[PDB]
Amino acid sequence: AGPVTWVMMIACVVVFIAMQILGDQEVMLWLAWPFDPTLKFEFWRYFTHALMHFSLMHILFNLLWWWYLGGAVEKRLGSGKLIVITLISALLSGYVQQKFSGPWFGGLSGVVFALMGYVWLRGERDPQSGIYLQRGLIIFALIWIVAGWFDSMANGAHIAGLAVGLAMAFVDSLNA
């Protein structure tokens, strides 16, 4: 449990608290993916969608997975690796979710699915990294995706994240 793991758990709790004081919609207006081309130069929105959660159980569920897996990446591969997985995965899972269903979505599961993808593949192709995902959880992960197809989930985020995490994990398991 290091600096980037906790800095992101604080950001999500801080933003969650603001959504309870200001209301979901008020925060959404400022942190969500650009809904209007004129807003395209509001840099933060490509990332900030990931900090917003809509219930306590989803914030809990998400931050816990972020702790288990994100903490594992930071501990073993360092803070710069977790930053880069987070920024790339948040941007691209955002970009895909926007095309599938438009800009009104939020949550850290985009990033979480890239973490589950990276930790699983990296731990199979470069075991020496010191990270791994149990098969009991690669079943939970896959059941989680498919239970979103048959139904309130951001399906584009789920699958774009996962893909990003396999891609990066693959590249990093050549450079090893």
Binding site: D24, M28, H49, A50, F54, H58, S93, Q97, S101, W104, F105, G106, G107, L108, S109, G110, S152, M153, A154, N155, A157, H158, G161
Partner: peptide, 4 residues
């Protein structure tokens, strides 16, 4: 809205 959808849950990511």
């Amino acid at each position: 809205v959808r849950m990511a």
